[PDB]
């Protein structure tokens, strides 16, 4: 029957909460663009080559060091440093849990009751985006989000 076309996983970028009702999940992997690590159609001559079909498997590992600069009720500000690695796969036969896209960087997060959660992060991608001819690092990236985008 095949895997359903809905309820798929999209990895890469700033990430977004599960606001959609179709089950689509956006995972955050700093240092790379949005949905840049999702598997793409590789049939080339399928008239839809390069389109992101969605992933059925995903695993992300992250480590962070946070230091609080202010933790008052009016405003809570803390700095963080991260070391992430994650990847998405199209099927179980292609699942390689230890073949991940690594990234590193730092960010700042500010939380105000009226303005909500504000976050700015700078990540560096140590791997190339899927479908890239040259095996070169993705490079620096900037991510900005408002609210709990998990």
């Amino acid at each position: 029957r095949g895997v359903v076309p809905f309820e798929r996983f999209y990895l890469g970028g700033d990430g977004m909460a599960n606001y959609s009702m179709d089950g689509r999940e956006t995972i955050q992997l700093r240092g790379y663009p949005n949905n840049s690590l999702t598997p793409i159609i590789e049939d080339r001559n399928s008239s839809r080559y390069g389109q992101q079909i969605g992933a059925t498997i995903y695993n992300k590992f992250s480590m962070e060091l946070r230091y609080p600069i202010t933790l008052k009720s009016s405003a809570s500000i803390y700095a963080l440093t991260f070391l992430e690695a994650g990847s998405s796969y199209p099927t179980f036969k292609d699942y390689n849990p230890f073949d991940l896209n690594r990234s590193a960087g730092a960010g700042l997060r500010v939380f105000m009751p009226a303005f909500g959660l504000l976050g700015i992060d700078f990540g560096y991608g140590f791997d190339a985006l899927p479908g890239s001819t040259t095996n070169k690092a993705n490079g620096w990236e900037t991510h900005f989000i408002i609210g709990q985008q998990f």
Binding site: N45, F61, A85, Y95, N96, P97, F98, D99
Partner: protein, 390 residues
């Protein structure tokens, strides 16, 4: 994103990556003592000795310098080593996690440019076999534990060879992909006694059964410019993972010092696939000899914190089991480490440095000198505590 850079990963199922957690990897794999805060993934009986829930994660940064009779090259690799969870359930112990069985990786370039009509090859390899495990341990006695586990092996090994002549601009790129899947079972036991005053005798025995690996191969040849690839008929080959018997014994005082030795032997296996079949390469039985231990100056010390850090060290001699050019490939190395306990909790941060030499430059082979730096996180917390005073 590869895990290894050794050309020897081409043969067999790749280079053996997992060799224990940083706490045990820093002791050359000697896990005789029945720890209460660390996970001994290689022995299922250790799951029963856990006293608090344990969550472990590890990573390493490897640096190697490949040397041959022609020249030398430097390579570095960074990878995620493991993820395991331990849960104490009464007299039982349950553990589940994900570990890398083997890894395939090499990036060799034969530059024959500057001369018209010369073929240039760009050999590359990636992938490996991963393992998922679920083990249960039981305390037959307060100091005697037995356990069993089930492990499912899965992974994909892809080998690519691209050749391009100096003159023409359209080259060819042959790629071989193999998907492996299988399951195996492990059995173990750990017994601890008290020979002398405050001195204990630790013993551990583990056995891994032989498993059958199913490999689905797909070989396709592509040429630049041509939109139609030449694909070979699909094939299915069967591999046999050899059985392993690990015997360990040591003497020492708990929380003070420990000295032990471990002997690991492997049976007969069939790791030769369709793409790695060669005539100059053979296989033999794997055998590892290691000696290691730890030393804690004063665990219950309030003056100096350096006395509470667990200092580990170990020596290891391994016979990989492959004979290339009639020369047995052996790996010799030394490991050092330290376990820093986070104040106020049983959780700790492990740091280790391993250096050694694999292979030899004789008989036109390749020798690899590596210096690996690893970091591990062991988190412990007590769960399932009932709250009275209804």
């Amino acid at each position: 994103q590869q895990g290894t850079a050794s050309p020897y990963s081409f043969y067999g199922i790749g280079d053996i990556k997992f060799k224990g957690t940083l706490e045990y990897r820093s002791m050359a794999g000697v896990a005789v003592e029945q720890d209460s805060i660390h996970l001994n993934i290689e022995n299922p009986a250790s799951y029963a000795s856990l006293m608090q829930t344990t969550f472990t994660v590890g990573g390493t940064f490897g640096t190697s310098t490949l040397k041959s009779n022609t020249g030398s090259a430097k390579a570095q690799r960074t990878t995620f080593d493991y993820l395991a969870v331990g849960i104490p359930v009464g007299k039982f112990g349950v553990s589940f996690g994900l570990i890398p069985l083997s890894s395939v990786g090499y990036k060799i370039l034969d530059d024959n440019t500057a001369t018209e009509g010369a073929v240039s090859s760009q050999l590359s390899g990636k992938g490996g076999i991963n393992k998922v495990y679920f083990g249960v341990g039981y305390k037959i006695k307060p100091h005697w534990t037995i356990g069993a586990d089930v492990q499912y092996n899965f992974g994909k090994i892809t080998t690519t060879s691209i050749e391009q002549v100096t003159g023409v601009q359209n080259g060819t790129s042959e790629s071989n992909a193999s998907t492996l899947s299988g399951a195996n079972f492990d059995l173990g036991t750990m017994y601890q006694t008290k020979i002398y005053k405050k001195v204990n005798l630790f013993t551990s025995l583990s056995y891994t059964f032989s498993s059958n690996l199913n490999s689905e191969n797909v070989r396709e040849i592509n040429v630049s410019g041509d939109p139609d690839p030449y694909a070979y008929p699909a094939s299915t080959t069967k591999l046999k993972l050899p059985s392993r018997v690990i015997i360990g014994a040591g003497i020492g005082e708990s929380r003070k010092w420990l000295v032990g030795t471990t002997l690991a032997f492997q049976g007969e296996g069939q790791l030769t696939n369709y793409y790695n079949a060669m005539d100059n390469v053979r296989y033999e039985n794997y055998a590892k000899y290691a000696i290691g231990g730890y030393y804690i100056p004063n665990y219950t010390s309030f003056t100096s914190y350096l006395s509470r850090i667990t200092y580990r060290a170990g020596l290891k001699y391994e016979k990989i089991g492959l004979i290339v050019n009639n020369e047995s490939i052996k790996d010799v190395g030394m490991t050092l480490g330290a376990g820093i306990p986070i104040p106020g909790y049983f959780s700790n941060v492990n740091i280790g440095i391993e250096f050694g030499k694999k292979g030899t430059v004789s008989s036109n082979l390749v020798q690899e000198n590596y210096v690996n730096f690893s970091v591990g996180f062991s988190f412990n917390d007590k769960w399932f505590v009932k709250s009275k005073f209804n």
